Amino acid sequence: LLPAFQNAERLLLAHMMRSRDVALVVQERIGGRFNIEEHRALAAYIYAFYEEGHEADPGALISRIPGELQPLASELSLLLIADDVSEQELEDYIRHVLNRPKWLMLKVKEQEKTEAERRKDFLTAARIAKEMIEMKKM
Amino acid sequence: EAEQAVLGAVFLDPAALVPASEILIPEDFYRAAHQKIFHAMLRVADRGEPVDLVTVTAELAASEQLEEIGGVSYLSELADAVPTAANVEYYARIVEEKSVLRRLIRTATSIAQDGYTREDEIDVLLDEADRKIME
Amino acid sequence: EAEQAVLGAVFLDPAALVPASEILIPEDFYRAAHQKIFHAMLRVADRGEPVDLVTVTAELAASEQLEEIGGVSYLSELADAVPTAANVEYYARIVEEKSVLRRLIRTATSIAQDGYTREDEIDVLLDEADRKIMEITGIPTGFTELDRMTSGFQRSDLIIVAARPSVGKTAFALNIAQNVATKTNENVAIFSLEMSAQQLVMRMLCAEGNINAQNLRTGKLTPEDWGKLTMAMGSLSNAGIYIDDTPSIRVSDIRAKCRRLKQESGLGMIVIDYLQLIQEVSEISRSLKALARELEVPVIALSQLRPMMSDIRESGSIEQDADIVAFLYEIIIAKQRNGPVGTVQLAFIKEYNKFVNL
Amino acid sequence: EAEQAVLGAVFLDPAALVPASEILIPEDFYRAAHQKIFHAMLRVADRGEPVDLVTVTAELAASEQLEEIGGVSYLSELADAVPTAANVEYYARIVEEKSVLRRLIRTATSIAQDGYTREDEIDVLLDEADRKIMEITGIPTGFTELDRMTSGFQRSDLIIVAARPSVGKTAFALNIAQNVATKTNENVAIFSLEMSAQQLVMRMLCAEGNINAQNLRTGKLTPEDWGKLTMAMGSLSNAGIYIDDTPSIRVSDIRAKCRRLKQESGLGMIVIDYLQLIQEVSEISRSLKALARELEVPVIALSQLRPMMSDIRESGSIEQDADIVAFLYEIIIAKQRNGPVGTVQLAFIKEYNKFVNL
Amino acid sequence: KCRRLKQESGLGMIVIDYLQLIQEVSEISRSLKALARELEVPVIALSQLRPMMSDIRESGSIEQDADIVAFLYEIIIAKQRNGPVGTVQLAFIKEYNKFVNL
Known part of the structure; x- marks a missing residue:
């Protein structure tokens, strides 16, 4: 069904593609910095676009946009959205994208927990785990 | 789609349940599985206790429809899938509407269907046709 | 699931333990691995010292049921899986309830099973039947x-x-x-x-x-x-x-x-x-x-x-x-x-x- | 066997019926056949008229379970088999006992069976579990x-x-x-x-x-x-x-x-x-x-x-x-x-x- | 019937002869209020019971749906939302069956 951050990435594109007023806010806050390759290249294409002073509408964007991005950028312009992103909506989406590299992180120390466990160093693996609980609390 | 959002957002906030239940009753959901969840969701709120993954999967299991929905798998899918809980209400309005449309369709279909079987009535037919369309 | 929630929440608060233990003793837990953890959890609290991932993995190890549960892996799983510890009590009540249910069934089945092996008694059978059911x-x-x-x-x-x-x-x-x-x-x-x-x-x-x-x-x-x-x-x-x-x-x-x-x-x-x-x-x-x-x-x-x-x-x-x-x-x-x-x-x-x- | 004794002794005394009925109701009998008889036995006593072989066989016939038991052959079998009617009461106590045991089992088995189907209740289950057992x-x-x-x-x-x-x-x-x-x-x-x-x-x-x-x-x-x-x-x-x-x-x-x-x-x-x-x-x-x-x-x-x-x-x-x-x-x-x-x-x-x- | 008349000729008033005789009454009171609202026209329900409020109230709601409740006794306007509440007095001829000014 797709994990959260990804839907947030998705929905953010759907919005900025539809409203270039949102796209301006997304640019200062997220690079991207987007987590998926397709989502990065699109972001680039979205950002530029209006910096060409460009009015705003997907009918213009989906026509831009190498062609290998189109089957994806087309099906985002049709997604499902109210036009108007709540003040917090944006802060919630952005939070997901921005603190994704941090989750992708703790799976590095995850592989160190399980490796310590195998050499029977039990109390060190516990410490790593107690540390992960901390990062996870964020 | 909107249906999954409401359910998901509850697992997330879960003060999300308050506005979702102000706008939806279980029956508004098209899929049974979701009906069962949202009902469970509420049945747990009626103490209680509060409402979250484990507490709900526990009610579903108690009244034995856990595996009658998805598993905990479909509950977790819903929970992990949802990115935010500032919509919900929503989402709720959408589900509420598609519910309204189905009820329209039904009561209207019922009139047409009823058109051939009475005949007989005309006047009961035309009266319980406003009565049915006004509700 | 409710069981994992309690344990998991302890590794989180861990003032979660206080109400968990007010409501559950280890035996209320259906899984033994959980029985062993919750007991060790308590055995640590009885100092001491306090109760966290490390200290518990330690007690388990010291009474040698560490790998007889999960490893630290399952202890980390509990920890890393639970989001909130404002429930616990809970959760606690859920497990407590299902424990009671098992205890009903056990003492009820034991009555029927006992119905054929005495016969003989009737009156001890019927008295130690209220005694057992009470x-x-x-x-x-x-x-x-x-x-x-x-x-x-x-x-x-x-x-x-x-x-x-x-x-x-x-x-x-x-x-x-x-x-x-x-x-x-x-x-x-x-x-x-x-x-x-x-x-x-x-x-x-x-x-x-x-x-x-x-x-x-x-x-x-x-x-x-x-x-x-x-x-x-x-x-x-x-x-x-x-x-x-x-x-x-x-x-x-x-x-x-x-x-x-x-x-x-x-x-x-x-x-x-x-x-x-x-x-x-x-x-x-x-x-x-x-x-x-x-x-x-x-x-x-x-x-x-x-x-x-x-x-x-x-x-x-x-x-x-x-x-x-x-x-x-x-x-x-x-x-x-x-x-x-x-x-x-x-x-x-x-x-x-x-x-x-x- | 003790069931056959009571029934038998009634055909004999038949003031035997009185102590039998003070200690048994038809339901206490395990075999339906005897249930039917003992009921008819009582239903004849509620006149009446009195109670003896022909008068019972006639009530059984009336409500049409005569051939649904034995025939008159089983009634006679019971009548001719029994050597005395100074026990009955008995005999009665034996059947009454084995009745209580079946109820015990039933209400106890109803609790276990009920243990899985609720869950849900625990508290209704534990209350209608004393209620049922009492x-x-x-x-x-x-x-x-x-x-x-x-x-x-x-x-x-x-x-x-x-x-x-x-x-x-x-x-x-x-x-x-x-x-x-x-x-x-x-x-x-x-x-x-x-x-x-x-x-x-x-x-x-x-x-x-x-x-x-x-x-x-x-x-x-x-x-x-x-x-x-x-x-x-x-x-x-x-x-x-x-x-x-x-x-x-x-x-x-x-x-x-x-x-x-x-x-x-x-x-x-x-x-x-x-x-x-x-x-x-x-x-x-x-x-x-x-x-x-x-x-x-x-x-x-x-x-x-x-x-x-x-x-x-x-x-x-x-x-x-x-x-x-x-x-x-x-x-x-x-x-x-x-x-x-x-x-x-x-x-x-x-x-x-x-x-x-x- | 009132709806059809509106679109074809005009319409300014609906004067229903007595409510207790239409075919529970609290569910009819509700509908007559909605009828007035939908047609932008004053509906005049007549009702059967001194007088005062609790004479009709004890028989089916009405009180909270009707925004003006007149009594014939004197014309007692006992409830209205436009403003004033009091007694207006009218003469009554009989032979001509008229209510007249004073």
Whole structure:
């Protein structure tokens, strides 16, 4: 069904593609910095676009946009959205994208927990785990 | 789609349940599985206790429809899938509407269907046709 | 699942353990691995020292059931899997319940199994069968010494004021609403489900300019009444009162109308006229609490029932949702979380329809 | 085999039927065939007419189960087989026993089977699990001339104190509980279903240190009040009172809580606040009597209704279970099994909330 | 019937002869209020019972749906939302069956 951050990435594109007023806010806050390759290249294409002073509408964007991005950028312009992103909506989406590299992180120390466990160093693996609980609390 | 959002957002906030239940009753959901969840969701709120993954999967299991929905798998899918809980209400309005449309369709279909079987009535037919369309 | 939640929550709070252990002993846990953890969890608490991932993985190891559970992997799994430890107790109750169920079944099955092997007894069989089966802050109120116990009325609290018919519960709420509007600079929202909107206005026009025996109702007034209403009208004219008398309305609508007024003009109080008359009540109480919390505004729900707690309780929850429960009799503030609980005594005029200080 | 003996012996004596029927109903028989016979046997006896081979074979035929048993051949088989009818009763007891065993098994198997299908309930399951499986002396009162007619309050009696609303039945039971706690050395258990546990406490704090017009409720006290609560608190601080204000509880939970308290600390009185408010009442009355019997402790059940017997009787038995029925009006001991029945007269303070001697 | 008339000719008043005789009454009162609202026209329900409020109230709601409640006795306007509440007095001829001014 797709994990959260990804839907947030998705929905953010759907919005900025539809409203270039949102796209301006997304640019200062997220690079991207987007987590998926397709989502990065699109972001680039979205950002530029209006910096060409460009009015705003997907009918213009989906026509831009190498062609290998189109089957994806087309099906985002049709997604499902109210036009108007709540003040917090944006802060919630952005939070997901921005603190994704941090989750992708703790799976590095995850592989160190399980490796310590195998050499029977039990109390060190516990410490790593107690540390992960901390990062996870964020 | 909107249906999954409401359910998901509850697992997330879960003060999300308050506005979702102000706008939806279980029956508004098209899929049974979701009906069962949202009902469970509420049945747990009626103490209680509060409402979250484990507490709900526990009610579903108690009244034995856990595996009658998805598993905990479909509950977790819903929970992990949802990115935010500032919509919900929503989402709720959408589900509420598609519910309204189905009820329209039904009561209207019922009139047409009823058109051939009475005949007989005309006047009961035309009266319980406003009565049915006004509700 | 409920089992994992408890354990997991301990690795989180871990003041989660205190209520977990009040409710569960290890044996309540169906899985042994959990039995072993929860026991070790407690065995550590019994120093000591305190109870965290490390210290528990240690105790387990020391009594050599570390790998006889999961590894630290399953201990980390519990930890890393649970989001919140504000449940636990819980959770605790769930496992406790299912334990009891197993114990019923066990002692019940043991009775049937025992039904064929004795026979012989009947009377020991039947007796050891019962034997086995039996096991100021705030927002000022206007009224000096009400303010003191409460300090407001404050933001995010649901205040339920209950009184028997014709004791003055509406006339009391109105006077709060009025004092807040005319004296502060804070909009109040009144939903007057019972009495009409304009029949409400006179009742707080009267409450002001000290008008009425003469009477507004029975037509003509004296040059003293006239020259009075004018100031009363005038002073109430600039107040921040908004009235909605819509016959009998659902919660979602109280919440919708209040939400819109907050962003456009201000808001400081929601004074809903009587709960029992909005459109089970336990579901409404919950929703009013949440309304108060969302809008950072005290919600004053009026309610109909001596008095004392079980008078309203027996009709829909409320008790645990309302954080301050007033009674009109004497204003008995029988429950509040700010602090004090006791009786504040007010005077009541009638002719003017005012509650006044003492 | 013993089944065939009873049936047989009836064909023989046949005054044998009388003891058989005092100990068996048709349902006690395992074979339907015998059920049918024994029923017919009785149905002929309900004239009539009397009961013998031809007269039964004829009732069986009538209701057409003659060939559904044996023939007359099996009736004769039974008749000719039996050598004496001096047992029957028996035989009867044997069949009656094996009947009880089948019921035991059935209601026990119904619990296990029910264990998986609910889950859900636990508490309904655990209650309809006892329900299903179940199917001067003394202690001084404090008050001189109540003691005399009764000599206690003694252990295994259920005392029911009834009175119209606001006569003082709670304030009466509380003073009993208080005297017993402060003056003897015997733990008392109070269930105060109606009023809160802390609004109960000052009602017995007032009852002592002769405190309150000043008042505890209405904030501030005089030096005489302060220096008073301190000893009242002190004296009541060592008493053996236990309270439980749990909203409205079922019998099995009064019984479970009182049971645990007896083994761990002592127990002498169970003072339940009002019966009509516990959660047909005849089935509760029954259970309260048994509670008293099990714990060798006087149980005081307060009740709500001039007065006299038929005022409470018309609403759920009680009369034949309670061995002493008090009325507050005058204290009218209208029924007691110790001995005397009459009117004892007590003074009542109000301000202090005390009932006092005379 | 009132709806159809509006669109074809005009319409300004609906005067229903007595309510207690239409075919529970609180559910009819509700509908007549909604009828007035939908047609932007004053509906005049007649009702059968001194007088005062609790004479009709004890027989099916009405009180909270009707925004003006007149009594014939004197014409007592006992409830209205436009404003005033009191007694207007009218003469009555009989022979001509007229109510007249004063």
